[PDB]
Amino acid sequence: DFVLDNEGNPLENGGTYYILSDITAFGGIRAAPTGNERCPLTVVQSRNELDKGIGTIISSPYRIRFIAEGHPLSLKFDSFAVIMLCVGIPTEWSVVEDLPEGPAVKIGENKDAMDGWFRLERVSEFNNYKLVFCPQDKCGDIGISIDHDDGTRRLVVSKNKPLVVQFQKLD
């Protein structure tokens, strides 16, 4: 039914949440420049355990009060600090296709951005979830691709995935 945060409350449709790792090994989700990016355009899982990440606004086009499993979603980062050259970067999550490490989750303006919706599905006693992307059924798990040069944990559409997350309310 409703997706629940780590306090057991249904996610508010349009609310802001930290997307935290299910294990104590990693921090939350944020943005980092990767490859030849000069702005933080790659959606990544922080390697710093203390790092909550950036608050993410989770919403469905449906005018239901709470986020339900299986409903189509849009994700976008709440405002975060960037250098002046990067101010005004769009913060909606996109899946940009035919990238080296497979279809990757990016923010900013993407011409290659696949049409589709994210959805949440429960995996776990504890309130654990995975993200899937459904291009506009046939849906792919979001998992992690480790940058070889960087070590950066990039969010990608990954068959042998998925990333398991829990939510914590900003409020």
Binding site: G14, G15, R63, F66
Partner: protein, 223 residues
């Protein structure tokens, strides 16, 4: 409802609240035993609350009845947002009175321009959120299909109507889903989806009930 007003108490007697812990969707009473709502409001456990005005306070007029049958349209498509309609059979009939009454199903579809009343306990802000205790009301016209199709290119099916204002400022919103759009005493829309709330050029999109009258009659009769 963004930009509406507080309805007069029990002046929308067909309005219901679907409650699963708290209010999460609306719906409409179409006879003593059946409620119509949005398919995306489907949940395994639902309590229907009738006769409500202040959903936070017991006023003495309420009837709380559990859903017995919950039947989503057989062609509902979660990710194309299409055929977004569901019927709930109450586990016992509502007592019909001044505060609890049925709304009529449409005899035909509504013409563009027809003024309608939308109601619900959803968010009243287009930025941030504020959920009201008291039922909110809004008068808004059916938009032309060409207007509607141009607002959401590629997304509008034949089972969807747009109701509202291209200027924005007034719209239904999160928590209004499943609730009624009533024009000329007939249920013509079910609150379904939109991009944000009350945004310019982004009107609300509603399930086109006049397409479903036979399915509705058919389901009630067989069940």
């Amino acid at each position: 409802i963004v930009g509406g007003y507080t309805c007069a108490a029990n002046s929308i007697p067909y309005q219901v609240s679907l409650n699963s812990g708290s209010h999460f969707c609306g719906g409409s009473l179409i006879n003593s035993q059946w409620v119509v709502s949005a398919a995306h409001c489907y949940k395994s456990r639902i309590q229907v609350r009738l006769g409500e005005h202040n959903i936070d306070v017991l006023e003495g007029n309420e009837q709380f009845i559990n859903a017995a049958k919950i039947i989503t349209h057989p062609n509902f498509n979660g990710n194309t947002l299409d055929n977004d309609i569901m019927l709930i059979k109450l586990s016992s009939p509502a007592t019909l009175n001044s505060r609890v009454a049925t709304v009529s199903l449409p005899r035909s579809c509504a013409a563009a321009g027809t003024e309608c009343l939308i109601s619900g306990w959803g968010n009243t802000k287009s930025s941030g959120s504020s959920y009201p205790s008291l039922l909110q009301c809004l008068k808004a016209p059916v938009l032309s299909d060409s207007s509607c199709k141009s607002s959401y290119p590629g997304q509008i099916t034949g089972n969807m109507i747009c109701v509202g204002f291209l200027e924005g400022g007034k719209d239904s919103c999160q928590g209004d889903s499943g609730g009624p759009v009533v024009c000329n005493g007939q249920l013509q829309g079910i609150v379904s989806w939109g991009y944000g709330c009350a945004q310019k050029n982004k009107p609300g999109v509603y399930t086109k009930v006049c397409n479903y009258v036979n399915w509705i009659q058919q389901t009630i009769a067989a069940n």
